[PDB]
Amino acid sequence: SPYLITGIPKDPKHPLPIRKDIDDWYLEQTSAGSNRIQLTLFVEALTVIQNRPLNDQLSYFRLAGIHGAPWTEWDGVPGGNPTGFCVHNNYTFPTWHRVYVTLYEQVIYEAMLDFIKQNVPQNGKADWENEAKQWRLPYWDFARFARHDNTQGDELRLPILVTMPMVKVLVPGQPGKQLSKPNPLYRFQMQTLMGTLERPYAITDLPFDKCQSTTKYGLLENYNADVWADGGQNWLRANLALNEHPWYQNLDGWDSVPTLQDMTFRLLTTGGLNWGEFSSTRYDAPKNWMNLEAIHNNVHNWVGGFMFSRPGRHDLKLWGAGHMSSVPVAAYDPIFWLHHCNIDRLTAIWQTVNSGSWFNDDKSKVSKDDDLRPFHRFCEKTRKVVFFRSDDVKDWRSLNYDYAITKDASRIRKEISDLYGQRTKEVYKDFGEEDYILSIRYSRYALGGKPFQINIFFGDVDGKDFYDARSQNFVGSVFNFSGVLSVSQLPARLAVHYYKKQNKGEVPTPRYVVVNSQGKAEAEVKVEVALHKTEGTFYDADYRRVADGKRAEVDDAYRA
Amino acid sequence: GPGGSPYLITGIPKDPKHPLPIRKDIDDWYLEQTSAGSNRIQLTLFVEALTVIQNRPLNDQLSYFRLAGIHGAPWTEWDGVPGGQGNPTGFCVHNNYTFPTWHRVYVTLYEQVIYEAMLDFIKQNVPQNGKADWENEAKQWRLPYWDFARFARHGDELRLPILVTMPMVKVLVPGQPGKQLSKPNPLYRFQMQTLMGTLERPYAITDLPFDKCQSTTKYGLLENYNADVWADGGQNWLRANLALNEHPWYQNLDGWDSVPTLQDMTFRLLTTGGLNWGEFSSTRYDAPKNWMNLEAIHNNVHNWVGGFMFSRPGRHDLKLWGAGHMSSVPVAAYDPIFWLHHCNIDRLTAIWQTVNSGSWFNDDKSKVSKDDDLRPFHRFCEKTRKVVFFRSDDVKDWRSLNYDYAITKDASRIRKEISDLYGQRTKEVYKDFGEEDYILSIRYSRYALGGKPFQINIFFGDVDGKDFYDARSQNFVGSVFNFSGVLSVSQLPARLAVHYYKKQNKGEVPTPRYVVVNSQGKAEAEVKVEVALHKTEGTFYDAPADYRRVADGKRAEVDDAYRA
């Protein structure tokens, strides 16, 4: 203390190493011919970090603690509606998280070196150190189709490694030996319930205080409270949510496009946005409302689940809540960091194709000089420890990492298309050259700070089923990741086409429902939803409003 | 066993201070153990003893692996009785009248080994002043049963046991007053140190990729995921619960009430009188109203808990397939829930025996098997003073094994208890409709697919050619699982599904349509099944105070891409 965040130190033998796609990296590391060293290093180092005590500010718990609960000090910067250090709904969203991810990466690297120092016999040390110095925190490409057996598949998925309870690693000094160990990327587990930790670290209306382990969709009402201690990792349910798309696409004869991928492709290829428009959900032209924070919000929801219960009786239960949907505790789930690593990558990509657009508009310019608390660095000019500022990390390479996609950025627009654009283009091309988008504007605080989901429908809404891709006439969702207004944007092109085919070319009135964590509709949360149209496809590139949203009513038993 | 000494199976030794302790409902027992009114000692003992048993080495025949190994794979010897029994087969009895008695002994073995491990634990870990108190808890403990047919507490649905759904469990730390510790729960899964396909000879587990599992799983094995995911596919207990609550498709519609088929079937099994032992005891077939049998119910539960389909044709965002140990004969016993399931199968046998006292290997068919050696289980014979194999007559009175069940304590109350536990929902829903009963009869060969498992699904009305799998498939009525890997019979309730069909079709009786589904989720066209619908006047539950065939089944066709 102070802990100076520098990124991994420069070594001339390791020029700007890349953060790799975690599935690519896992597959390479576990191939027959790979030495398996980086995988062993990441597993062992993260395990050590997770087992460090609470009074160690570089323990996993305390590093995750920076983001939200239990809202304590970190690195000498005081903590204590409770709020964390994390920046939400402001234009410093991408830069604060850029530093946060780098802190995590640096801590892991240093733990890797400790592991080598302690456990690798001297004749192997140079080789292991070489691998550590090449290692960078992998990213989870949430918008890229998972492979399937080397070929590109057709669905979005959680990383392979994240879905494995155990992982086999090397035994240093014993060539050819491997041991299966608990996988620290699978979950973060403490020794007791998080609500019982010694003061001031205790995590105390989702029962996160009753969890010992992080969970994905594991928390449901009407099960014994001891089940919540470790609700498990329902990664199959998470994968289903990540592949959210309009309801009609489940019907025979229609091709589906994952909304997350369409959104990501739109975010990366749309020109003309200023930093304020791109960087945040913050709203101080609807075509410019698609932003990085909004996509990040939805992914948080889809990975963890936010609904603890549902009214009525249902044999098939698709609700269930978990850490990733919840601001105060999302950072405890190890996938948090891989997700945020990709958020950093998307920022880096966008920066590369929008080089003039950096805190450049009247709105975002005000926030440019914000201290990014609690992150410290040494100012060589004044010889003083100071807080990070956004300009310090404008070039991510000054933190000594890079991404392959920005590394040789020669053909970055083609790469964007190959990764995130092919399916969208393939399906859209069958229909007329026009685009439709939904605009959504809401207040994060509409439920006093509690989270909620805004679901949009074209056509009649099922009064007992207004939740997801399996709900009749579902078009898309916007999640309020919470726990001055906010905006988001949804693709609407394909959903409008289907509606038009069934309704004599009529333009649909977007119908919306605001859903709470009890699966009930909040009748009085204000949302501004509109439908906008232009000529020409979005990827070949002025929008006009063609319909206003209307709140849908749900069944009595389902109303909040 | 070692030194040429057999392991004598006796049940927990009799202590006059502990007269016939009961095997309790595992949810009631867990809830009690963790309540303010308890000391948490039996929970601690069961957790610590079972952990030790699971960590014993492969050459220890009382290790968890080797006890589970008696049932099926890796088909080795046990207690000096040769294994390696044209397909490989284990010691377990299936499709024969000794099914209940073989398993009665098997469950007692497991219980006895755990008790002995509890005594070891106390000897080594409990301070001197506490040893007698802890020993008395061990002497009271008996293996809990999972009441798969009872609504779960704080109920309206069937569920896996609470404890089975918990990765960790908090136990006492003996000698440290007030101290408890969260530990890995040995009932949640059984995990080895390497993939089971790589164990030292001759113990390696070598269609479903069980050779690539390090841990047991429920619904965790799906094609099109990295093979490393199969090492521990997880415990999808929510998915298992969904399967356990299987019921006709129509009941998911608005305005209709549901009844879990498992509970209806169990209530029918326990209340229908007049069955001989051969009818009750087994799926084996050497009147269709008497085809509801214990083994068929056991078969379906194995399927529902584990999952048996590795893949499905086509593309589907919502994936409700997935396979797991409990659905597969060769490896089912590795999943710790296996023993809790079989404990309840023993309890159902005991209940049935209580209300059918003259019906014990009594008919001409089952009589032949009464004197079968229940290998590999040894006991000391008091009459001849020699070590022999168990035989069914030895365990006719389960109390001779020094355990009992609360429900079998009082024959004068058993009919009310059966009603209270398994009959309330059925009666509540059936009462809204006319006084007649309908049942489906199902007869098939276990070897129809060369010994591979399959599921027979029955429908009333048009079958969706891409969706013919479960309660969400249009017009689904019920399923029969061939737990495999002389014919076999099962029976399904059809009363409510028939009423729904009649209401939609001007009172016409449905033709039962069936599809035989394999582990790839495809329909088998050549598997012969005899399905028929039968009717009588009066409700089945009022009967204790003659079915006529009314329709014959026919195979339904599925979409070309979904054909085997």
PDB file of N, CA and C in Angstrom, chain A residues 26-27 30 148 154-155 157 160 163-166 180 187 189 191 212 220 222-224 226-227 230 235-236 239-240 245 250 252 256 313 315-318 423 464 470, chain B residues 30-31 34 156-157 159 162 165-168 182 189 191 193 214 222 224-226 228-229 232-233 236-238 241-242 245 247 252 254 258 315 317-320 466 472:
ATOM      1  N   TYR A  26      -7.886 -22.127 -23.964  1.00  0.00           N
ATOM      2  CA  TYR A  26      -8.106 -23.406 -23.289  1.00  0.00           C
ATOM      3  C   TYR A  26      -7.849 -24.598 -24.221  1.00  0.00           C
ATOM      4  N   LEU A  27      -8.365 -24.534 -25.445  1.00  0.00           N
ATOM      5  CA  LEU A  27      -8.148 -25.611 -26.414  1.00  0.00           C
ATOM      6  C   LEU A  27      -6.659 -25.819 -26.739  1.00  0.00           C
ATOM      7  N   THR A  30      -4.793 -27.393 -23.642  1.00  0.00           N
ATOM      8  CA  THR A  30      -5.095 -28.786 -23.318  1.00  0.00           C
ATOM      9  C   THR A  30      -4.862 -29.754 -24.460  1.00  0.00           C
ATOM     10  N   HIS A 148     -17.619 -25.869 -32.735  1.00  0.00           N
ATOM     11  CA  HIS A 148     -18.022 -27.287 -32.854  1.00  0.00           C
ATOM     12  C   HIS A 148     -18.505 -27.625 -34.271  1.00  0.00           C
ATOM     13  N   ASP A 154     -22.990 -22.666 -34.009  1.00  0.00           N
ATOM     14  CA  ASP A 154     -24.099 -21.761 -34.266  1.00  0.00           C
ATOM     15  C   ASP A 154     -24.755 -21.221 -32.993  1.00  0.00           C
ATOM     16  N   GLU A 155     -24.106 -21.375 -31.848  1.00  0.00           N
ATOM     17  CA  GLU A 155     -24.642 -20.739 -30.660  1.00  0.00           C
ATOM     18  C   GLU A 155     -23.591 -20.048 -29.815  1.00  0.00           C
ATOM     19  N   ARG A 157     -22.053 -19.229 -26.174  1.00  0.00           N
ATOM     20  CA  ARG A 157     -21.901 -20.056 -24.975  1.00  0.00           C
ATOM     21  C   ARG A 157     -20.976 -19.390 -23.978  1.00  0.00           C
ATOM     22  N   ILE A 160     -15.743 -22.744 -22.195  1.00  0.00           N
ATOM     23  CA  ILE A 160     -15.581 -24.164 -21.812  1.00  0.00           C
ATOM     24  C   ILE A 160     -15.065 -24.285 -20.373  1.00  0.00           C
ATOM     25  N   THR A 163     -17.330 -23.903 -17.391  1.00  0.00           N
ATOM     26  CA  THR A 163     -18.343 -24.928 -17.171  1.00  0.00           C
ATOM     27  C   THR A 163     -17.784 -26.221 -16.567  1.00  0.00           C
ATOM     28  N   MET A 164     -16.500 -26.219 -16.219  1.00  0.00           N
ATOM     29  CA  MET A 164     -15.830 -27.406 -15.672  1.00  0.00           C
ATOM     30  C   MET A 164     -15.577 -27.276 -14.162  1.00  0.00           C
ATOM     31  N   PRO A 165     -16.179 -28.155 -13.344  1.00  0.00           N
ATOM     32  CA  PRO A 165     -15.878 -28.155 -11.902  1.00  0.00           C
ATOM     33  C   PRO A 165     -14.393 -28.368 -11.552  1.00  0.00           C
ATOM     34  N   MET A 166     -13.689 -29.216 -12.301  1.00  0.00           N
ATOM     35  CA  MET A 166     -12.290 -29.531 -12.021  1.00  0.00           C
ATOM     36  C   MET A 166     -11.471 -29.289 -13.271  1.00  0.00           C
ATOM     37  N   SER A 180      -5.958 -33.569 -11.252  1.00  0.00           N
ATOM     38  CA  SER A 180      -7.251 -32.892 -11.360  1.00  0.00           C
ATOM     39  C   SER A 180      -7.503 -32.076 -10.088  1.00  0.00           C
ATOM     40  N   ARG A 187     -16.327 -21.262  -9.886  1.00  0.00           N
ATOM     41  CA  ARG A 187     -17.101 -20.565  -8.870  1.00  0.00           C
ATOM     42  C   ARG A 187     -16.087 -19.939  -7.926  1.00  0.00           C
ATOM     43  N   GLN A 189     -15.722 -19.831  -3.875  1.00  0.00           N
ATOM     44  CA  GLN A 189     -16.303 -20.414  -2.668  1.00  0.00           C
ATOM     45  C   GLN A 189     -15.552 -19.916  -1.438  1.00  0.00           C
ATOM     46  N   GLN A 191     -15.249 -20.187   3.014  1.00  0.00           N
ATOM     47  CA  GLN A 191     -15.347 -21.270   3.994  1.00  0.00           C
ATOM     48  C   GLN A 191     -16.658 -21.236   4.780  1.00  0.00           C
ATOM     49  N   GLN A 212     -22.477 -19.382   0.293  1.00  0.00           N
ATOM     50  CA  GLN A 212     -21.079 -19.663   0.570  1.00  0.00           C
ATOM     51  C   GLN A 212     -20.323 -19.555  -0.759  1.00  0.00           C
ATOM     52  N   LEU A 220     -33.538 -19.926  -5.969  1.00  0.00           N
ATOM     53  CA  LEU A 220     -34.981 -19.921  -6.212  1.00  0.00           C
ATOM     54  C   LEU A 220     -35.732 -19.983  -4.881  1.00  0.00           C
ATOM     55  N   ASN A 222     -38.771 -21.059  -2.356  1.00  0.00           N
ATOM     56  CA  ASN A 222     -39.454 -22.346  -2.154  1.00  0.00           C
ATOM     57  C   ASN A 222     -38.543 -23.562  -2.198  1.00  0.00           C
ATOM     58  N   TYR A 223     -37.249 -23.350  -1.964  1.00  0.00           N
ATOM     59  CA  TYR A 223     -36.322 -24.435  -1.676  1.00  0.00           C
ATOM     60  C   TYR A 223     -35.672 -24.169  -0.331  1.00  0.00           C
ATOM     61  N   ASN A 224     -35.176 -25.223   0.308  1.00  0.00           N
ATOM     62  CA  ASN A 224     -34.584 -25.091   1.638  1.00  0.00           C
ATOM     63  C   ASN A 224     -33.418 -24.111   1.560  1.00  0.00           C
ATOM     64  N   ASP A 226     -30.605 -23.974   2.939  1.00  0.00           N
ATOM     65  CA  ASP A 226     -29.284 -24.603   2.811  1.00  0.00           C
ATOM     66  C   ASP A 226     -28.912 -24.889   1.349  1.00  0.00           C
ATOM     67  N   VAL A 227     -29.909 -24.946   0.471  1.00  0.00           N
ATOM     68  CA  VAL A 227     -29.643 -25.116  -0.966  1.00  0.00           C
ATOM     69  C   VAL A 227     -28.952 -23.868  -1.522  1.00  0.00           C
ATOM     70  N   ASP A 230     -24.793 -23.135  -1.839  1.00  0.00           N
ATOM     71  CA  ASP A 230     -24.164 -23.308  -3.147  1.00  0.00           C
ATOM     72  C   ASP A 230     -25.221 -23.777  -4.142  1.00  0.00           C
ATOM     73  N   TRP A 235     -24.920 -23.601 -16.129  1.00  0.00           N
ATOM     74  CA  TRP A 235     -24.368 -23.007 -17.341  1.00  0.00           C
ATOM     75  C   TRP A 235     -25.226 -23.285 -18.581  1.00  0.00           C
ATOM     76  N   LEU A 236     -25.956 -24.400 -18.591  1.00  0.00           N
ATOM     77  CA  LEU A 236     -26.838 -24.690 -19.708  1.00  0.00           C
ATOM     78  C   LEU A 236     -27.966 -23.657 -19.759  1.00  0.00           C
ATOM     79  N   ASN A 239     -26.421 -20.392 -21.035  1.00  0.00           N
ATOM     80  CA  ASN A 239     -26.269 -20.458 -22.488  1.00  0.00           C
ATOM     81  C   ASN A 239     -27.584 -20.173 -23.209  1.00  0.00           C
ATOM     82  N   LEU A 240     -28.676 -20.739 -22.696  1.00  0.00           N
ATOM     83  CA  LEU A 240     -29.995 -20.494 -23.281  1.00  0.00           C
ATOM     84  C   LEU A 240     -30.317 -18.998 -23.296  1.00  0.00           C
ATOM     85  N   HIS A 245     -33.369 -14.380 -28.585  1.00  0.00           N
ATOM     86  CA  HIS A 245     -33.735 -13.865 -29.896  1.00  0.00           C
ATOM     87  C   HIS A 245     -35.260 -13.729 -29.926  1.00  0.00           C
ATOM     88  N   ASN A 250     -38.370 -19.248 -33.127  1.00  0.00           N
ATOM     89  CA  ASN A 250     -38.529 -20.621 -32.667  1.00  0.00           C
ATOM     90  C   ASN A 250     -39.457 -21.400 -33.588  1.00  0.00           C
ATOM     91  N   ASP A 252     -41.100 -23.025 -36.983  1.00  0.00           N
ATOM     92  CA  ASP A 252     -40.508 -23.758 -38.089  1.00  0.00           C
ATOM     93  C   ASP A 252     -40.395 -22.872 -39.331  1.00  0.00           C
ATOM     94  N   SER A 256     -32.833 -18.091 -36.990  1.00  0.00           N
ATOM     95  CA  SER A 256     -32.658 -17.272 -35.805  1.00  0.00           C
ATOM     96  C   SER A 256     -31.312 -16.559 -35.830  1.00  0.00           C
ATOM     97  N   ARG A 313     -48.186 -21.614 -10.916  1.00  0.00           N
ATOM     98  CA  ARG A 313     -47.556 -22.927 -10.848  1.00  0.00           C
ATOM     99  C   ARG A 313     -46.958 -23.289 -12.191  1.00  0.00           C
ATOM    100  N   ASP A 315     -44.279 -26.338 -13.859  1.00  0.00           N
ATOM    101  CA  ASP A 315     -43.418 -27.503 -13.697  1.00  0.00           C
ATOM    102  C   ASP A 315     -42.032 -27.178 -14.213  1.00  0.00           C
ATOM    103  N   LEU A 316     -41.978 -26.649 -15.429  1.00  0.00           N
ATOM    104  CA  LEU A 316     -40.725 -26.213 -16.025  1.00  0.00           C
ATOM    105  C   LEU A 316     -40.387 -24.854 -15.435  1.00  0.00           C
ATOM    106  N   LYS A 317     -39.237 -24.761 -14.783  1.00  0.00           N
ATOM    107  CA  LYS A 317     -38.872 -23.548 -14.060  1.00  0.00           C
ATOM    108  C   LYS A 317     -37.645 -22.920 -14.689  1.00  0.00           C
ATOM    109  N   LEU A 318     -37.825 -21.781 -15.346  1.00  0.00           N
ATOM    110  CA  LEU A 318     -36.721 -21.190 -16.086  1.00  0.00           C
ATOM    111  C   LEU A 318     -36.223 -19.926 -15.406  1.00  0.00           C
ATOM    112  N   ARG A 423     -23.846 -14.043 -39.572  1.00  0.00           N
ATOM    113  CA  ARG A 423     -25.188 -14.582 -39.349  1.00  0.00           C
ATOM    114  C   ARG A 423     -26.267 -13.523 -39.566  1.00  0.00           C
ATOM    115  N   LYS A 464     -49.468 -14.538 -18.551  1.00  0.00           N
ATOM    116  CA  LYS A 464     -48.786 -15.402 -17.580  1.00  0.00           C
ATOM    117  C   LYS A 464     -47.395 -15.775 -18.077  1.00  0.00           C
ATOM    118  N   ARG A 470     -39.123 -17.598 -25.110  1.00  0.00           N
ATOM    119  CA  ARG A 470     -40.207 -18.559 -25.251  1.00  0.00           C
ATOM    120  C   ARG A 470     -41.582 -17.938 -24.988  1.00  0.00           C
TER     121      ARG A 470
ATOM    122  N   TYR B  30     -33.236 -34.799   7.577  1.00  0.00           N
ATOM    123  CA  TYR B  30     -32.362 -33.642   7.378  1.00  0.00           C
ATOM    124  C   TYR B  30     -32.921 -32.405   8.092  1.00  0.00           C
ATOM    125  N   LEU B  31     -34.221 -32.170   7.934  1.00  0.00           N
ATOM    126  CA  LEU B  31     -34.871 -31.017   8.548  1.00  0.00           C
ATOM    127  C   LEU B  31     -34.775 -31.081  10.068  1.00  0.00           C
ATOM    128  N   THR B  34     -31.090 -30.464  11.371  1.00  0.00           N
ATOM    129  CA  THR B  34     -30.629 -29.091  11.265  1.00  0.00           C
ATOM    130  C   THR B  34     -31.523 -28.132  12.038  1.00  0.00           C
ATOM    131  N   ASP B 156     -46.444 -29.110  -3.098  1.00  0.00           N
ATOM    132  CA  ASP B 156     -47.219 -29.441  -4.292  1.00  0.00           C
ATOM    133  C   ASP B 156     -46.388 -30.023  -5.452  1.00  0.00           C
ATOM    134  N   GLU B 157     -45.153 -30.436  -5.196  1.00  0.00           N
ATOM    135  CA  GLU B 157     -44.427 -31.147  -6.243  1.00  0.00           C
ATOM    136  C   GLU B 157     -43.501 -32.222  -5.676  1.00  0.00           C
ATOM    137  N   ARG B 159     -39.854 -34.039  -5.496  1.00  0.00           N
ATOM    138  CA  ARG B 159     -38.496 -33.477  -5.593  1.00  0.00           C
ATOM    139  C   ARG B 159     -37.434 -34.491  -5.191  1.00  0.00           C
ATOM    140  N   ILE B 162     -33.583 -32.866  -0.278  1.00  0.00           N
ATOM    141  CA  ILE B 162     -32.867 -31.618  -0.032  1.00  0.00           C
ATOM    142  C   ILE B 162     -31.342 -31.836  -0.022  1.00  0.00           C
ATOM    143  N   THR B 165     -29.247 -32.172  -3.096  1.00  0.00           N
ATOM    144  CA  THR B 165     -29.127 -30.987  -3.969  1.00  0.00           C
ATOM    145  C   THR B 165     -28.123 -29.974  -3.439  1.00  0.00           C
ATOM    146  N   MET B 166     -27.411 -30.359  -2.382  1.00  0.00           N
ATOM    147  CA  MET B 166     -26.454 -29.484  -1.709  1.00  0.00           C
ATOM    148  C   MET B 166     -25.004 -29.931  -1.932  1.00  0.00           C
ATOM    149  N   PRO B 167     -24.183 -29.084  -2.580  1.00  0.00           N
ATOM    150  CA  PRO B 167     -22.768 -29.432  -2.774  1.00  0.00           C
ATOM    151  C   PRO B 167     -21.979 -29.586  -1.483  1.00  0.00           C
ATOM    152  N   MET B 168     -22.329 -28.820  -0.446  1.00  0.00           N
ATOM    153  CA  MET B 168     -21.618 -28.847   0.836  1.00  0.00           C
ATOM    154  C   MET B 168     -22.631 -29.026   1.940  1.00  0.00           C
ATOM    155  N   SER B 182     -18.374 -26.445   7.147  1.00  0.00           N
ATOM    156  CA  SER B 182     -18.956 -26.813   5.865  1.00  0.00           C
ATOM    157  C   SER B 182     -17.974 -27.731   5.133  1.00  0.00           C
ATOM    158  N   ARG B 189     -22.667 -36.288  -4.966  1.00  0.00           N
ATOM    159  CA  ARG B 189     -22.064 -36.962  -6.122  1.00  0.00           C
ATOM    160  C   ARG B 189     -21.004 -37.907  -5.588  1.00  0.00           C
ATOM    161  N   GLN B 191     -17.149 -38.777  -6.588  1.00  0.00           N
ATOM    162  CA  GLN B 191     -16.079 -38.285  -7.461  1.00  0.00           C
ATOM    163  C   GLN B 191     -14.812 -39.096  -7.224  1.00  0.00           C
ATOM    164  N   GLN B 193     -10.527 -39.675  -8.394  1.00  0.00           N
ATOM    165  CA  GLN B 193      -9.410 -38.761  -8.648  1.00  0.00           C
ATOM    166  C   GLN B 193      -9.042 -38.663 -10.123  1.00  0.00           C
ATOM    167  N   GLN B 214     -15.223 -38.443 -14.334  1.00  0.00           N
ATOM    168  CA  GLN B 214     -14.525 -38.542 -13.063  1.00  0.00           C
ATOM    169  C   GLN B 214     -15.556 -38.568 -11.919  1.00  0.00           C
ATOM    170  N   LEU B 222     -24.073 -34.307 -22.484  1.00  0.00           N
ATOM    171  CA  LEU B 222     -24.706 -33.936 -23.748  1.00  0.00           C
ATOM    172  C   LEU B 222     -23.656 -33.910 -24.855  1.00  0.00           C
ATOM    173  N   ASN B 224     -21.914 -32.587 -28.256  1.00  0.00           N
ATOM    174  CA  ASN B 224     -21.625 -31.235 -28.750  1.00  0.00           C
ATOM    175  C   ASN B 224     -21.158 -30.261 -27.672  1.00  0.00           C
ATOM    176  N   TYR B 225     -20.510 -30.806 -26.648  1.00  0.00           N
ATOM    177  CA  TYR B 225     -19.769 -29.998 -25.677  1.00  0.00           C
ATOM    178  C   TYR B 225     -18.373 -30.619 -25.590  1.00  0.00           C
ATOM    179  N   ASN B 226     -17.384 -29.829 -25.182  1.00  0.00           N
ATOM    180  CA  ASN B 226     -16.010 -30.323 -25.041  1.00  0.00           C
ATOM    181  C   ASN B 226     -16.012 -31.526 -24.103  1.00  0.00           C
ATOM    182  N   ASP B 228     -14.035 -32.521 -21.978  1.00  0.00           N
ATOM    183  CA  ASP B 228     -13.640 -32.175 -20.607  1.00  0.00           C
ATOM    184  C   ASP B 228     -14.845 -31.798 -19.718  1.00  0.00           C
ATOM    185  N   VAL B 229     -15.923 -31.318 -20.330  1.00  0.00           N
ATOM    186  CA  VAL B 229     -17.153 -31.017 -19.589  1.00  0.00           C
ATOM    187  C   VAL B 229     -17.748 -32.295 -18.987  1.00  0.00           C
ATOM    188  N   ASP B 232     -16.954 -33.887 -15.138  1.00  0.00           N
ATOM    189  CA  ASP B 232     -17.954 -33.672 -14.087  1.00  0.00           C
ATOM    190  C   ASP B 232     -19.085 -32.851 -14.682  1.00  0.00           C
ATOM    191  N   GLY B 233     -20.136 -33.541 -15.108  1.00  0.00           N
ATOM    192  CA  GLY B 233     -21.231 -32.900 -15.803  1.00  0.00           C
ATOM    193  C   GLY B 233     -22.169 -32.139 -14.874  1.00  0.00           C
ATOM    194  N   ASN B 236     -27.788 -31.612 -12.268  1.00  0.00           N
ATOM    195  CA  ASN B 236     -28.883 -30.762 -12.699  1.00  0.00           C
ATOM    196  C   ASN B 236     -30.141 -31.228 -11.974  1.00  0.00           C
ATOM    197  N   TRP B 237     -30.235 -30.895 -10.693  1.00  0.00           N
ATOM    198  CA  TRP B 237     -31.326 -31.397  -9.876  1.00  0.00           C
ATOM    199  C   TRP B 237     -32.668 -30.755 -10.239  1.00  0.00           C
ATOM    200  N   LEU B 238     -32.663 -29.506 -10.704  1.00  0.00           N
ATOM    201  CA  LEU B 238     -33.893 -28.867 -11.150  1.00  0.00           C
ATOM    202  C   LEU B 238     -34.480 -29.618 -12.348  1.00  0.00           C
ATOM    203  N   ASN B 241     -35.965 -32.866 -11.073  1.00  0.00           N
ATOM    204  CA  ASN B 241     -37.268 -32.605 -10.461  1.00  0.00           C
ATOM    205  C   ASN B 241     -38.359 -32.468 -11.523  1.00  0.00           C
ATOM    206  N   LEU B 242     -38.037 -31.805 -12.630  1.00  0.00           N
ATOM    207  CA  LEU B 242     -39.018 -31.635 -13.692  1.00  0.00           C
ATOM    208  C   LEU B 242     -39.488 -33.001 -14.207  1.00  0.00           C
ATOM    209  N   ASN B 245     -41.835 -35.001 -11.944  1.00  0.00           N
ATOM    210  CA  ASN B 245     -43.213 -34.521 -11.933  1.00  0.00           C
ATOM    211  C   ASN B 245     -43.948 -34.733 -13.258  1.00  0.00           C
ATOM    212  N   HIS B 247     -46.363 -35.802 -16.072  1.00  0.00           N
ATOM    213  CA  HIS B 247     -47.806 -35.968 -16.049  1.00  0.00           C
ATOM    214  C   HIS B 247     -48.288 -35.709 -17.468  1.00  0.00           C
ATOM    215  N   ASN B 252     -50.845 -29.110 -18.424  1.00  0.00           N
ATOM    216  CA  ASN B 252     -50.141 -27.837 -18.497  1.00  0.00           C
ATOM    217  C   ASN B 252     -51.011 -26.713 -19.051  1.00  0.00           C
ATOM    218  N   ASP B 254     -54.325 -24.156 -19.280  1.00  0.00           N
ATOM    219  CA  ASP B 254     -55.059 -23.410 -18.263  1.00  0.00           C
ATOM    220  C   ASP B 254     -56.364 -24.095 -17.892  1.00  0.00           C
ATOM    221  N   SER B 258     -53.070 -30.673 -12.229  1.00  0.00           N
ATOM    222  CA  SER B 258     -52.134 -31.759 -12.511  1.00  0.00           C
ATOM    223  C   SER B 258     -51.996 -32.741 -11.359  1.00  0.00           C
ATOM    224  N   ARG B 315     -32.108 -28.808 -34.290  1.00  0.00           N
ATOM    225  CA  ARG B 315     -31.470 -27.749 -33.524  1.00  0.00           C
ATOM    226  C   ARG B 315     -32.514 -27.217 -32.553  1.00  0.00           C
ATOM    227  N   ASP B 317     -32.868 -24.475 -29.085  1.00  0.00           N
ATOM    228  CA  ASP B 317     -32.273 -23.559 -28.116  1.00  0.00           C
ATOM    229  C   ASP B 317     -32.450 -24.106 -26.702  1.00  0.00           C
ATOM    230  N   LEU B 318     -33.688 -24.444 -26.351  1.00  0.00           N
ATOM    231  CA  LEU B 318     -33.986 -25.058 -25.062  1.00  0.00           C
ATOM    232  C   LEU B 318     -33.648 -26.541 -25.134  1.00  0.00           C
ATOM    233  N   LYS B 319     -32.688 -26.973 -24.327  1.00  0.00           N
ATOM    234  CA  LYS B 319     -32.210 -28.345 -24.410  1.00  0.00           C
ATOM    235  C   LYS B 319     -32.613 -29.104 -23.164  1.00  0.00           C
ATOM    236  N   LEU B 320     -33.555 -30.033 -23.298  1.00  0.00           N
ATOM    237  CA  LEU B 320     -34.056 -30.749 -22.126  1.00  0.00           C
ATOM    238  C   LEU B 320     -33.576 -32.194 -22.110  1.00  0.00           C
ATOM    239  N   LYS B 466     -41.474 -33.996 -34.385  1.00  0.00           N
ATOM    240  CA  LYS B 466     -40.191 -33.470 -33.899  1.00  0.00           C
ATOM    241  C   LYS B 466     -40.177 -33.314 -32.376  1.00  0.00           C
ATOM    242  N   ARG B 472     -44.041 -32.048 -22.094  1.00  0.00           N
ATOM    243  CA  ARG B 472     -44.237 -30.850 -22.904  1.00  0.00           C
ATOM    244  C   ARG B 472     -44.530 -31.175 -24.372  1.00  0.00           C
TER     245      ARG B 472
END
